[PDB]
Each structure stands twice: as C-alpha cells, then as structure tokens.
C-alpha cells in the first residue's frame, strides 16, 4: 500500500565525533515517499512499526587503523541516541589507493517521531562520487 | 499485518563442527513477535511462506586462514541441514587486532516447522560485545 | 499476496566489458514466482512498484587490483543501462588463495518491463561452486 519508504544516495559532504552524513533525497535513484521525510540529515519516521533499514558506505584512501559505519536512532523522549547497526572493519594496507564498502541492513521496531542517521568514523574517506556506491534507505515492512 | 518477525542480537557465547551461535531475543533491540519463536538456538518458523533472512557476524582477532558465517535451515522431515547463505572471507594480517563483519541476507521459501540457525567457523573470534555488531533476523515478506 | 519474487543462485559460467552473470532459477534454493521471469540473464520485472533487490558474489583467487559487483537496470525506453548498486573492494594479498564476498541490497522503484542483471569485473574470479555463496534476488515490497 502506501508504506513509508526512502532510498537516499551519497553527495559530496559539506565539511563540519562520528559525524552524520547528509544525503541526496530526490535526484537520480533517490527518493522519499509516503510521509517519509528527509530533513536535517535525518530520516524522520511518520508511523510506528517495524522497518527494514540499510546502508552501504564505500570508503577509499586518498593511515586510519579501521573504518566504521553506524546507523543511529534518535528518539524525542530519550536523550541518548541508540546505535542500531555497526559495521567496523580494520583497514589493511599502507599507502594507499584502497577502497572498500561496508554494508548493513536489519529490521527494527520504530516509533512515529524517530529520526535515523548514518555516522562514519571519517567523512573524508567516504566515496561520494556515485549514487550506487554509498546510500541509506528504510521501508515500513 | 501480524507477520512473523524476529531480530536477535549477539551475547557472550557459552562454550561447548561449525558451532551454532545463541542469541539475545528480547532485551535491547532484540525481539520476536507474531508466533516467531526463538528456542534452543533456533528461530522456529510458524507459517510457511517466503522470508527474508539476514545476519551479520563481526569477527575480531584476539592465526585462522579465513572466517565463515553460514545460515542453515533444519527441516523436520529431511535429515540433512540445508545451507541457505554462506559468507566466507580469507583473513589478511598476522597478529593481530583486526576485526571484520560478514553480512548476509536473502529471501527463501520456508515451511512451518523449519528451524534456522547461524553457524561460524570459530566462536572465539565472534565479537559479542555489542548488540549492533552481531545479529540475526527474519521476517515473513 | 502474489508479489513477484525471485531468488537466483550461481552456476558455472559459460565463457563469452563487465560481463553479466547467468544464474540458476529453479533448482535447489532458486526460484521465480508471481510473474517474475528469468530470461536471457535478466530478471524481467512484471509490475511497476518498489522492489528490494540484492546480490552477493563471492570472489576467489585461482593479480587483480580490485573486484567489483554492479547490479544494473535496463529499461526499454532509455538506451543506457542504469547502475543501481555497486560494490567494489580493492584486493589485498599476492598469490593467492584469497576469497571474498561482496554483498549489496537496496530498494528501487522499478517499471514493468525493466530488466535487472548483475555484472562483475572478472567472471573467472567468481566462485560458482555453491548456491549459498553467490546469488541474486528481488521482491516487490
């Protein structure tokens, strides 16, 4: 039916302690629909329910011991953000022209009013060049 | 509607030839609902249908040539367990303080009575510290 | 209800510039149903809607700087294929008996008539030995 859904895709990040990524939400393959609202680097949840949520962040060098992606839920009532999913990968070679994707997806019970965001260990390692490499989405099941 | 669904999260494993993991099923972000039953290290399927099933296992050193996760289906009638999904990754450096996630998810037609579990090549390499790093879930589509 | 769905699993590829993989569609764990049609290395979409689409390709050595999987949409009207998802991973050791999975999944709005395929940087590195290691699926949400 009309289930809230969104697919967001990476853009060049505007420089600003795991910083949140900000996203493309309507151009190319990105979109939000059915009351799903992308606002202020958050996906804002319109309807309480169980959602499948996912993200891939491709990292590329050009030093760090590891790279990490975390998908986080912020709730109006609760002060502290809740980590939903964490992908952390220690990084192997010196140099270098390495690259690598960290993908995560799972199902969570969310409340109307919740806000989701994706944080990374190092924004300058995020590959922003292409909407098919780094993305973030969620849909009511 | 009321579709069977469960998200399970890692706990410290109680020591016991690809051993099955056992899981948190109700505390923090974990849950089972709509007839989904977590029992005896299995997710037991209440209703025949097509399910999306997924798991991430984060591994960390502190030797092994590789690390492997397998999601397996046990069926009452059939004797032999069926491997649904396998993620195997050869491991790179000596030492060491490496870590790394293996994520897998896909859709399968399951029968009422089926049991799913997650096995790993080495339980002592599984990072159990955090519910957002190692998890296992399934939902009727 | 009757939502188009398919899970496809790897086979040995018949030798034929990111070549498309061809798949098992009915034996073992593979299947197509509800008007989903696997034909000519494409999954052909019967009904316009939002789909979750996913693939894992396990690569194994036995040289390449990196390995890449791309899931692509071909549309009747548009000439150029659209890359939906790309997983690219630089490969680490010399030799060698390395292996490694690249997993990708996300949601896309598709039109009736669309065709999806999976391309890889090097078909000869794809591990074809087992239906649980390399697979490709899609379901209408």
């Amino acid at each position: 039916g009309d289930k809230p859904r969104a697919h967001l895709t990476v853009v060049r990040q505007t420089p600003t302690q795991f910083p949140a990524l900000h996203w493309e939400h309507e151009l190319g393959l990105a979109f939000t629909k059915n009351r799903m609202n992308y606002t202020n680097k958050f996906l804002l949840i319109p309807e309480s329910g169980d959602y499948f949520i996912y993200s891939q962040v491709t990292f590329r060098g050009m030093k760090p011991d590891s790279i990490t992606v975390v998908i986080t839920k912020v709730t109006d009532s609760y002060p502290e953000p809740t980590q939903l999913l964490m992908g952390t990968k220690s990084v192997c070679e010196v140099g270098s022209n390495w690259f690598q994707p960290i993908y995560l997806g799972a199902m969570f019970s969310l409340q109307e009013g919740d806000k989701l965001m994706v944080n990374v260990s190092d924004i300058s390692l995020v590959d922003y060049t292409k909407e098919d490499k780094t993305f973030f989405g969620a849909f009511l099941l």
Side-chain angles (χ1 to χ4, degrees), chain A residues 48-109:
Chain A
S48 290
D50 301 318
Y51 285 77
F52 188 83
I53 294 175
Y54 64 82
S55 178
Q56 170 174 272
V57 175
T58 301
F59 294 85
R60 40 106 205 102
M62 278 203 167
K63 185 197 266 62
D65 267 322
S66 66
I67 47 180
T68 299
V69 184
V70 182
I71 299 189
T72 294
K73 182 184 54 179
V74 168
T75 302
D76 271 320
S77 40
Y78 260 32
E80 257 24 78
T82 296
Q83 297 175 200
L84 303 184
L85 290 169
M86 171 177 295
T88 163
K89 180 158 190 326
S90 73
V91 27
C92 238
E93 64 278 54
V94 47
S96 209
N97 304 258
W98 59 273
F99 35 94
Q100 82 178 316
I102 283 163
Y103 178 96
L104 297 158
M107 163 186 58
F108 299 94
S109 298

Coordinates of all heavy atoms in Angstrom, one line a residue, chain A residues 48-109:
Chain A
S48 N 4.6 4.4 13.5 CA 5.3 3.4 14.3 C 5.0 2.1 13.6 O 4.0 1.9 13.0 CB 4.6 3.4 15.7 OG 5.0 4.6 16.3
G49 N 6.0 1.2 13.8 CA 6.0 0.0 13.0 C 7.4 -0.6 12.9 O 8.3 -0.1 13.5
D50 N 7.5 -1.8 12.3 CA 8.8 -2.4 12.0 C 9.3 -2.1 10.7 O 8.6 -2.2 9.7 CB 8.6 -3.9 12.1 CG 8.0 -4.3 13.5 OD1 8.5 -3.8 14.5 OD2 7.1 -5.2 13.5
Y51 N 10.5 -1.6 10.6 CA 11.1 -1.1 9.4 C 12.4 -1.9 9.1 O 13.1 -2.3 10.0 CB 11.6 0.3 9.5 CG 10.5 1.3 9.5 CD1 9.7 1.5 10.6 CD2 10.2 2.1 8.3 CE1 8.6 2.4 10.6 CE2 9.2 3.0 8.3 CZ 8.4 3.2 9.4 OH 7.4 4.1 9.4
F52 N 12.6 -2.1 7.8 CA 13.9 -2.6 7.4 C 14.7 -1.4 7.0 O 14.3 -0.5 6.3 CB 13.8 -3.6 6.3 CG 15.2 -4.3 6.0 CD1 15.6 -5.4 6.7 CD2 16.0 -3.8 4.9 CE1 16.8 -6.0 6.5 CE2 17.2 -4.5 4.7 CZ 17.6 -5.6 5.4
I53 N 16.0 -1.4 7.5 CA 16.8 -0.2 7.4 C 18.2 -0.6 6.9 O 18.7 -1.7 7.3 CB 17.0 0.4 8.8 CG1 15.7 0.9 9.3 CG2 18.0 1.5 8.7 CD1 15.8 1.4 10.7
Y54 N 18.8 0.1 6.0 CA 20.1 -0.4 5.4 C 20.9 0.8 4.9 O 20.4 1.9 4.6 CB 19.8 -1.3 4.2 CG 19.1 -0.6 3.1 CD1 19.8 0.1 2.2 CD2 17.7 -0.7 2.9 CE1 19.2 0.8 1.2 CE2 17.1 0.0 1.9 CZ 17.9 0.7 1.0 OH 17.2 1.4 -0.1
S55 N 22.2 0.5 4.8 CA 23.1 1.5 4.3 C 24.4 0.8 3.8 O 24.9 -0.2 4.4 CB 23.6 2.5 5.4 OG 24.5 3.4 4.9
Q56 N 24.9 1.3 2.7 CA 26.3 1.0 2.4 C 27.1 2.3 2.3 O 26.6 3.3 1.7 CB 26.4 0.2 1.0 CG 27.8 0.1 0.6 CD 28.0 -0.7 -0.6 OE1 28.1 -1.9 -0.5 NE2 28.0 -0.1 -1.8
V57 N 28.3 2.2 2.9 CA 29.2 3.3 2.7 C 30.5 2.7 2.2 O 31.1 1.9 2.8 CB 29.6 4.0 4.1 CG1 30.7 5.1 3.8 CG2 28.4 4.7 4.6
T58 N 30.9 3.2 1.0 CA 32.1 2.8 0.4 C 33.2 3.8 0.9 O 33.0 5.1 0.8 CB 32.0 2.9 -1.1 OG1 31.0 1.9 -1.5 CG2 33.3 2.5 -1.8
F59 N 34.3 3.3 1.4 CA 35.4 4.1 1.9 C 36.5 3.9 0.9 O 36.7 2.8 0.3 CB 35.9 3.6 3.2 CG 34.9 3.9 4.3 CD1 33.9 2.9 4.6 CD2 35.0 5.0 5.1 CE1 33.0 3.2 5.7 CE2 34.1 5.3 6.2 CZ 33.1 4.3 6.5
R60 N 37.4 4.9 0.7 CA 38.6 4.9 -0.1 C 39.7 5.7 0.5 O 39.4 6.8 1.1 CB 38.3 5.3 -1.5 CG 37.3 6.4 -1.7 CD 38.0 7.7 -2.1 NE 37.3 8.9 -1.7 CZ 37.6 9.6 -0.6 NH1 38.6 9.3 0.1 NH2 36.8 10.7 -0.4
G61 N 40.9 5.3 0.4 CA 42.1 6.0 0.9 C 42.4 7.1 -0.1 O 42.1 6.9 -1.3
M62 N 42.9 8.2 0.4 CA 43.3 9.3 -0.5 C 42.1 10.0 -1.2 O 40.9 9.7 -0.9 CB 44.3 8.9 -1.6 CG 45.8 8.8 -1.2 SD 47.0 8.9 -2.5 CE 48.6 9.3 -1.7
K63 N 46.7 5.0 6.7 CA 46.6 6.0 7.8 C 45.7 5.5 8.9 O 46.1 5.3 10.0 CB 46.3 7.4 7.3 CG 46.4 8.5 8.3 CD 45.6 9.8 7.8 CE 46.6 10.8 7.2 NZ 47.3 10.3 6.0
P64 N 44.4 5.4 8.6 CA 43.4 5.0 9.7 C 43.6 3.6 10.0 O 43.9 2.8 9.1 CB 42.1 5.2 9.0 CG 42.3 4.9 7.6 CD 43.7 5.5 7.3
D65 N 43.4 3.2 11.3 CA 43.5 1.8 11.6 C 42.3 1.0 11.1 O 42.5 -0.2 10.7 CB 43.8 1.6 13.1 CG 45.2 1.5 13.5 OD1 46.0 0.9 12.7 OD2 45.6 2.1 14.5
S66 N 41.1 1.6 11.2 CA 39.9 1.0 10.8 C 38.9 2.0 10.3 O 39.2 3.2 10.4 CB 39.3 0.4 12.0 OG 38.9 1.4 12.9
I67 N 37.8 1.5 9.7 CA 36.7 2.4 9.2 C 35.5 1.8 9.8 O 35.4 0.6 10.1 CB 36.6 2.3 7.7 CG1 36.7 0.9 7.2 CG2 37.8 3.2 7.0 CD1 36.6 0.5 5.7
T68 N 34.5 2.7 10.1 CA 33.3 2.3 10.8 C 32.1 3.1 10.3 O 32.2 4.3 10.0 CB 33.3 2.6 12.3 OG1 34.4 1.9 12.9 CG2 32.0 2.3 13.0
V69 N 31.0 2.4 10.0 CA 29.7 2.9 9.8 C 28.7 2.6 10.9 O 28.7 1.4 11.4 CB 29.0 2.3 8.6 CG1 27.7 3.0 8.3 CG2 30.0 2.5 7.4
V70 N 27.9 3.5 11.4 CA 26.9 3.2 12.4 C 25.6 3.9 12.0 O 25.6 5.0 11.5 CB 27.3 4.0 13.7 CG1 26.2 3.6 14.8 CG2 28.6 3.6 14.2
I71 N 24.5 3.2 12.1 CA 23.2 3.7 11.9 C 22.6 3.9 13.2 O 22.5 3.0 14.0 CB 22.3 2.8 11.0 CG1 23.0 2.5 9.6 CG2 20.9 3.4 10.8 CD1 22.1 1.8 8.7
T72 N 22.0 5.1 13.5 CA 21.6 5.5 14.8 C 20.2 6.0 14.7 O 19.7 6.5 13.8 CB 22.5 6.7 15.2 OG1 23.9 6.3 15.3 CG2 22.1 7.3 16.5
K73 N 19.5 5.8 15.9 CA 18.1 6.3 16.0 C 18.2 7.3 17.1 O 18.8 7.1 18.2 CB 17.3 5.1 16.5 CG 15.9 5.4 16.7 CD 15.1 4.1 17.3 CE 15.8 3.7 18.6 NZ 15.1 2.4 19.1
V74 N 17.5 8.4 16.8 CA 17.3 9.5 17.8 C 15.8 9.5 18.1 O 15.0 9.5 17.1 CB 17.7 10.9 17.4 CG1 17.2 11.9 18.3 CG2 19.3 10.9 17.3
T75 N 15.4 9.5 19.4 CA 14.0 9.5 19.8 C 13.7 10.8 20.6 O 14.6 11.2 21.4 CB 13.8 8.3 20.8 OG1 14.2 7.1 20.1 CG2 12.4 8.2 21.2
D76 N 12.6 11.4 20.4 CA 12.2 12.6 21.1 C 12.4 12.6 22.6 O 13.1 13.4 23.2 CB 10.8 13.1 20.7 CG 10.7 13.9 19.5 OD1 11.6 14.8 19.3 OD2 9.8 13.8 18.7
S77 N 11.8 11.6 23.2 CA 11.7 11.3 24.6 C 13.1 11.1 25.3 O 13.6 11.8 26.1 CB 10.7 10.2 24.9 OG 10.9 9.2 24.0
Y78 N 13.7 9.9 24.8 CA 15.1 9.6 25.3 C 16.1 10.6 24.9 O 16.0 11.2 23.7 CB 15.4 8.2 24.6 CG 15.3 7.0 25.5 CD1 14.4 7.0 26.5 CD2 16.2 6.0 25.4 CE1 14.2 5.8 27.3 CE2 16.1 4.8 26.2 CZ 15.1 4.8 27.2 OH 15.0 3.7 28.0
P79 N 17.1 10.9 25.8 CA 18.1 11.8 25.4 C 19.2 11.2 24.5 O 19.5 11.7 23.4 CB 18.8 12.2 26.8 CG 18.5 11.0 27.6 CD 17.2 10.4 27.1
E80 N 19.7 10.0 24.9 CA 20.8 9.3 24.2 C 20.4 8.6 22.9 O 19.3 8.0 22.9 CB 21.5 8.4 25.2 CG 22.8 8.9 25.8 CD 23.0 10.4 25.8 OE1 22.4 11.1 26.7 OE2 23.7 10.9 24.9
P81 N 21.2 8.8 21.9 CA 21.0 8.1 20.6 C 21.2 6.6 20.7 O 22.1 6.2 21.4 CB 22.0 8.8 19.7 CG 23.1 9.4 20.6 CD 22.3 9.8 21.8
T82 N 20.4 5.8 20.0 CA 20.6 4.4 20.1 C 21.3 3.9 18.8 O 20.9 4.2 17.8 CB 19.3 3.7 20.4 OG1 18.8 4.1 21.7 CG2 19.4 2.1 20.4
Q83 N 22.4 3.2 19.0 CA 23.0 2.5 17.8 C 22.3 1.3 17.4 O 22.1 0.4 18.2 CB 24.5 2.2 18.1 CG 25.4 3.5 18.3 CD 26.9 3.2 18.7 OE1 27.5 4.0 19.2 NE2 27.3 2.0 18.4
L84 N 21.8 1.3 16.2 CA 21.1 0.2 15.7 C 22.0 -0.8 15.0 O 21.9 -2.0 15.3 CB 20.0 0.7 14.7 CG 19.0 1.7 15.2 CD1 18.0 2.0 14.1 CD2 18.2 1.2 16.4
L85 N 23.0 -0.4 14.2 CA 23.8 -1.3 13.4 C 25.1 -0.7 13.4 O 25.2 0.5 13.2 CB 23.2 -1.2 11.9 CG 21.9 -1.9 11.7 CD1 21.2 -1.6 10.4 CD2 22.0 -3.4 12.0
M86 N 26.2 -1.5 13.5 CA 27.5 -1.0 13.4 C 28.4 -2.0 12.5 O 28.4 -3.2 12.7 CB 28.2 -0.8 14.8 CG 29.7 -0.5 14.6 SD 30.5 -0.1 16.2 CE 29.6 1.4 16.7
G87 N 29.0 -1.4 11.5 CA 30.0 -2.1 10.7 C 31.3 -1.5 10.8 O 31.6 -0.4 10.5
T88 N 32.3 -2.3 11.4 CA 33.6 -1.8 11.6 C 34.6 -2.7 11.0 O 34.5 -4.0 11.2 CB 33.9 -1.2 13.1 OG1 35.3 -1.1 13.2 CG2 33.3 -2.2 14.1
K89 N 35.5 -2.2 10.2 CA 36.4 -3.1 9.5 C 37.8 -2.5 9.7 O 38.0 -1.3 9.5 CB 36.0 -3.1 8.0 CG 36.9 -4.0 7.2 CD 36.2 -4.4 6.0 CE 37.1 -5.5 5.3 NZ 38.6 -5.2 5.6
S90 N 38.8 -3.3 10.2 CA 40.1 -2.8 10.3 C 40.7 -2.7 8.9 O 40.4 -3.5 8.0 CB 40.9 -3.6 11.3 OG 41.3 -4.8 10.8
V91 N 41.5 -1.7 8.6 CA 42.0 -1.5 7.2 C 43.4 -1.9 7.0 O 44.3 -1.6 7.9 CB 41.6 -0.1 6.6 CG1 41.5 1.0 7.7 CG2 42.7 0.4 5.6
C92 N 43.7 -2.5 5.9 CA 44.8 -3.4 5.8 C 46.2 -2.9 5.3 O 47.2 -3.0 6.0 CB 44.4 -4.6 4.9 SG 44.6 -6.2 5.6
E93 N 46.2 -2.2 4.1 CA 47.4 -1.8 3.6 C 47.8 -0.4 3.8 O 47.0 0.5 4.2 CB 47.5 -2.1 2.1 CG 46.5 -1.4 1.2 CD 45.1 -2.1 1.2 OE1 44.6 -2.3 2.3 OE2 44.6 -2.4 0.1
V94 N 49.1 -0.1 3.7 CA 49.7 1.2 3.8 C 49.7 1.9 2.4 O 49.5 1.2 1.4 CB 51.2 1.1 4.3 CG1 52.0 0.0 3.6 CG2 51.9 2.5 4.2
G95 N 49.7 3.2 2.4 CA 49.6 4.0 1.2 C 48.5 5.1 1.3 O 48.7 6.0 2.0
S96 N 47.4 4.9 0.5 CA 47.2 3.9 -0.5 C 46.0 4.1 -1.3 O 45.2 5.0 -1.0 CB 47.1 2.5 0.2 OG 47.6 1.5 -0.6
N97 N 45.8 3.4 -2.4 CA 44.6 3.5 -3.2 C 43.6 2.4 -3.0 O 43.1 1.8 -3.9 CB 45.0 3.6 -4.7 CG 45.9 4.8 -5.0 OD1 45.5 5.9 -5.5 ND2 47.2 4.6 -4.8
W98 N 43.4 2.1 -1.7 CA 42.4 1.0 -1.3 C 41.0 1.6 -1.4 O 40.8 2.8 -1.2 CB 42.8 0.5 0.1 CG 42.7 1.6 1.1 CD1 43.7 2.4 1.5 CD2 41.6 2.0 1.9 NE1 43.3 3.3 2.4 CE2 42.0 3.1 2.7 CE3 40.2 1.5 2.0 CZ2 41.1 3.7 3.6 CZ3 39.4 2.1 2.9 CH2 39.8 3.2 3.6
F99 N 40.0 0.7 -1.5 CA 38.7 1.1 -1.3 C 37.9 0.0 -0.7 O 38.2 -1.2 -0.9 CB 38.0 1.7 -2.5 CG 38.4 1.1 -3.8 CD1 37.6 0.1 -4.3 CD2 39.6 1.5 -4.4 CE1 38.0 -0.5 -5.5 CE2 40.0 0.9 -5.6 CZ 39.2 -0.1 -6.1
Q100 N 36.9 0.3 0.0 CA 36.1 -0.7 0.5 C 34.7 -0.4 1.1 O 34.6 0.6 1.8 CB 36.8 -1.6 1.4 CG 37.0 -1.1 2.7 CD 37.8 -2.2 3.4 OE1 37.5 -3.4 3.2 NE2 38.8 -1.8 4.1
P101 N 33.7 -1.2 0.8 CA 32.3 -1.0 1.2 C 32.0 -1.6 2.5 O 32.5 -2.7 2.7 CB 31.5 -1.7 0.0 CG 32.4 -2.8 -0.4 CD 33.9 -2.4 -0.1
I102 N 31.2 -1.0 3.3 CA 30.7 -1.6 4.5 C 29.2 -1.6 4.3 O 28.6 -0.5 4.1 CB 31.1 -0.9 5.8 CG1 32.6 -1.3 6.1 CG2 30.2 -1.4 6.9 CD1 33.2 -0.3 7.2
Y103 N 28.5 -2.7 4.2 CA 27.0 -2.8 4.0 C 26.4 -3.3 5.3 O 26.9 -4.2 5.9 CB 26.6 -3.7 2.9 CG 25.2 -3.8 2.7 CD1 24.5 -3.0 1.8 CD2 24.4 -4.6 3.5 CE1 23.1 -3.1 1.6 CE2 23.0 -4.7 3.4 CZ 22.4 -3.9 2.4 OH 21.0 -3.9 2.3
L104 N 25.3 -2.7 5.7 CA 24.5 -3.1 6.9 C 23.0 -3.0 6.6 O 22.6 -1.9 6.0 CB 24.7 -2.1 8.0 CG 26.1 -1.9 8.6 CD1 26.2 -0.5 9.3 CD2 26.3 -3.0 9.6
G105 N 22.2 -3.9 7.0 CA 20.8 -3.8 7.0 C 20.1 -4.7 8.0 O 20.6 -5.8 8.3
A106 N 19.0 -4.2 8.7 CA 18.2 -5.1 9.6 C 16.9 -4.5 9.9 O 16.6 -3.3 9.5 CB 19.0 -5.4 10.9
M107 N 16.1 -5.2 10.6 CA 14.7 -4.8 11.0 C 14.7 -4.3 12.4 O 15.2 -4.9 13.3 CB 13.8 -6.0 10.7 CG 12.4 -5.8 11.4 SD 11.5 -7.4 11.2 CE 12.6 -8.6 12.0
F108 N 14.0 -3.2 12.6 CA 13.8 -2.6 13.9 C 12.4 -2.0 14.1 O 11.7 -1.7 13.1 CB 14.8 -1.4 14.1 CG 16.2 -1.8 14.0 CD1 16.9 -1.8 12.8 CD2 16.9 -2.3 15.1 CE1 18.2 -2.2 12.7 CE2 18.2 -2.8 15.0 CZ 18.9 -2.7 13.8
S109 N 11.9 -2.1 15.4 CA 10.6 -1.5 15.7 C 10.8 -0.1 15.9 O 11.6 0.2 16.8 CB 9.9 -2.2 16.9 OG 9.8 -3.6 16.6

